[PDB]
Design a protein around this ligand. Structure first.
Ligand SMILES: CCCCCCCCCCCCCCCCCC(=O)OC[C@H](COP(=O)([O-])OC[C@H](O)COP(=O)([O-])OC[C@H](COC(=O)CCCCCCCCCCCCCCCCC)OC(=O)CCCCCCCCCCCCCCCCC)OC(=O)CCCCCCCCCCCCCCCCC
Ligand SMILES: CCCCCCCCCCCCCCCCCC(=O)OC[C@H](COP(=O)([O-])OC[C@H](O)COP(=O)([O-])OC[C@H](COC(=O)CCCCCCCCCCCCCCCCC)OC(=O)CCCCCCCCCCCCCCCCC)OC(=O)CCCCCCCCCCCCCCCCC
Lengths: 57, 459
């Protein structure tokens, strides 16, 4: 009683019911480095300008 | 200080928009007005310096140099308008513009609050003087005169540039007002030794130091008259001004590092005065005299007592006026005999009596005749060096002997004796030449009546 599968069927992506848990860290990655802190706050002007030796702005 | 920078910059449309016959009159008139206004810098106080803005200040050291700088421009315009009378109009306006641009760089060289802006202006003053010497000079070797001028003044100033930025990174500022209160004692080390040399050798070239002075009896000799006037009156004095600003930061390493330079100046004021006793060239004699008189200013800065700084600033102002007048006298005879040989035309009191009187006054102020401010500066530097070491009075008095000797030998050779038979183009003294001599000598004589305005920040 076995029907041979049609052209297209055996290459389908199927779904599988499992009773094993999902591997939570299959790559065994350690803790990620903490990122550099972003910038936050409004942009105040430069305190007394460029401060390049004598240029007051 | 902007109220003098802006009229100095308005002298450029005043000289480029004038009628072709009006370019000397207008520039002379308005530069005399700027020099009239320059006396408003005399608002000085016994405690505080006249601190205008973040960029400019003017204490009692920079103030007489500013009045002298703003006064020297009309005198250079009067002095140069005869030998350029056959010049192209556009080149004539370019000459006037180089003089105005040099004035503009000088009057914010002396008022620079911050020391790297002092450095930028202090090295910007070279390039108009460069163009004046090596464009409107006289003989063949004017290009070797400016080449050794530009090489010596930049090879000395180059370690000064690294030294001032090293002060900027370490102290935080090159404001002189800030560094009055944040100066730290500079100890004995080799790093601080080369620090002291980098801060000092630039102004040692610009004074000039004896041994570093060989650019000067070519840069003054091959220059035209306005170039020689501004070189002997202001551009030598930039070194004394920079030393008096920079020895604030160089204590107490100066108190044992100044000894070989004190020896060089105390012996070079003897050597260059002896050299003045044997000059065939009149303009060279005035040049070596300028070296011999600036050697005392170097000694008085390096021993750093109050009497020494008072005498050194008095001697800088007095020598600026006196040497400018002596170069103008030498040009007044060069415009007649077309040679700078001092032995060529003699006996000129028999032909020019009033000009011989101006020669006599300039010679008496050259040899520091009291009560001139020449003698006030000379005498105070001698007092402070006698306090420094009692044996230095021998070198000081011997220098004063040779100074009076070459001054009166210049007077005897140029003005006295038998006149030259084969020279017959000796014109009567023009009104322009006597106006030039009087506008030199009369301010110098008036400053003897009230000498306290030219005695620096610690009068
Ligand atoms: C109510 C609404 C309306 C209000 C209107 C109010 C104003 C009304 C008038 C409108 C026009 C305004 C014009 C600008 C304002 C005044 C700026 C000013 O004077 O600044 C003082 C400025 C700093 O002095 P301050 O006392 O500390 O500040 C006073 C104010 O607070 C200055 O303010 P600050 O401190 O905030 O300034 C910021 C900063 C202040 O500066 C600094 O922090 C110091 C560093 C400045 C640069 C230094 C560089 C040094 C090395 C290079 C030198 C180059 C050679 C010199 C020039 C050669 C000849 C071309 O500026 C700069 O750094 C800019 C660079 C310098 C340019 C200054 C403006 C020039 C405009 C006109 C140019 C015309 C040609 C003139 C010659 C060109 C060179 C100036 O002075 C200098 O730096 C010395 C130079 C003189 C400045 C220019 C004067 C402008 C007028 C010129 C008239 C004559 C022209 C003749 C023909 C052309 C030349 C042959
Ligand atoms: C603020 C108000 C002030 C008011 C008062 C003024 C203060 C003094 C200012 C200057 C004064 C003299 C200026 C002219 C002389 C130079 C040119 C000349 O010789 O022409 C000859 C000519 C007449 O002679 P000439 O027969 O036709 O021709 C002469 C021959 O060519 C042949 O020529 P020569 O060889 O026979 O003649 C040259 C002869 C040559 O004489 C000498 O070689 C002998 C001089 C040295 C030894 C004697 C003096 C030693 C020092 C002691 C005295 C001073 C202190 C006294 C106090 C008590 C003791 C501490 O010099 C004189 O005769 C001039 C006499 C006065 C000499 C002053 C010291 C000069 C020596 C070098 C500097 C010394 C240190 C500085 C002293 C500063 C004193 C203020 O004179 C005039 O035409 C004079 C014109 C008007 C002059 C106005 C002066 C003021 C200008 C300032 C304007 C702004 C303020 C307003 C004041 C207005 C006042 C009216």
């Amino acid at each position: 009683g076995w029907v041979r599968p049609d052209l297209g069927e055996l290459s389908k992506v199927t779904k599988v019911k499992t009773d094993r848990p999902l591997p939570e860290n299959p790559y065994h990655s350690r803790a990620r480095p903490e990122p550099n802190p972003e910038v936050e706050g409004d942009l105040k002007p430069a305190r007394h300008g460029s401060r390049l030796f004598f240029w007051t702005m | 200080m902007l109220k003098y920078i802006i009229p100095t910059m308005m002298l450029m449309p005043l000289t480029w928009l004038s009628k072709n016959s009006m370019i000397w009159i207008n520039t002379t008139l308005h530069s005399l007005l700027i020099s009239l206004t320059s006396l408003l810098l005399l608002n000085q106080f016994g405690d505080n310096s006249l601190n205008f803005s973040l960029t400019f200040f003017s204490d009692s050291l920079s103030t007489p140099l500013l009045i002298l700088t703003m006064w020297l421009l009309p005198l250079m315009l009067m002095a140069s308008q005869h030998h350029l009378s056959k010049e192209n109009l556009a080149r004539k306006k370019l000459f006037i513009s180089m003089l105005i641009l040099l004035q503009l760089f000088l009057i914010m060289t002396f008022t620079a609050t911050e020391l790297i802006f002092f450095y930028i202006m202090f090295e910007a003053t070279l390039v108009p003087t460069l163009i004046i010497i090596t464009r409107w000079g006289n003989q063949t070797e004017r290009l070797n005169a400016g080449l050794y001028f530009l090489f010596y003044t930049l090879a000395g100033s180059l370690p000064l540039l690294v030294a001032l930025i090293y002060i900027q990174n370490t102290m935080g500022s090159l404001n002189f007002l800030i560094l009055q209160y944040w100066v730290q004692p500079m100890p004995n080390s080799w790093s601080n030794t080369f620090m002291w040399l980098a801060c000092m050798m630039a102004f040692m070239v610009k004074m000039p130091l004896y041994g570093l002075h060989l650019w000067l009896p070519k840069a003054h000799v091959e220059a035209p008259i306005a170039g020689s006037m501004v070189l002997a009156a202001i551009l030598l004095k930039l070194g004394g001004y920079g030393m008096m600003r920079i020895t604030l930061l160089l204590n107490p390493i100066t108190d044992f590092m100044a000894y070989p330079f004190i020896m060089l100046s105390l012996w070079g004021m003897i050597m260059t005065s002896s050299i003045c006793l044997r000059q065939t060239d009149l303009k060279s004699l005035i040049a070596y005299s300028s070296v011999s008189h600036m050697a005392l200013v170097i000694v008085a800065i390096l021993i750093q007592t109050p009497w020494s700084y008072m005498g050194a600033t008095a001697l800088m102002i007095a020598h600026g006026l006196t040497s400018s007048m002596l170069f103008c006298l030498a040009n007044s005879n060069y415009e007649r005999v077309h040679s700078r040989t001092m032995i060529l035309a003699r006996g000129l009191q028999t032909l020019l009596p009033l000009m011989a009187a101006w020669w006599l006054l300039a010679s008496l102020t050259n040899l520091a005749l009291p009560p001139s401010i020449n003698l006030i500066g000379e005498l105070f530097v001698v007092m402070s060096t006698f306090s420094w070491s009692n044996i230095t009075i021998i070198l000081m008095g011997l220098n004063m002997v040779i100074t009076a000797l070459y001054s009166l030998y210049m007077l005897i050779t140029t003005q006295r004796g038998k006149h030259t038979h084969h020279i017959n183009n000796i014109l009567p003294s023009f009104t322009r030449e006597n106006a030039l001599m009087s506008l030199h000598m009369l301010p110098l004589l008036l400053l003897s009546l009230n000498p306290k305005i030219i005695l620096g920040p610690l009068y």
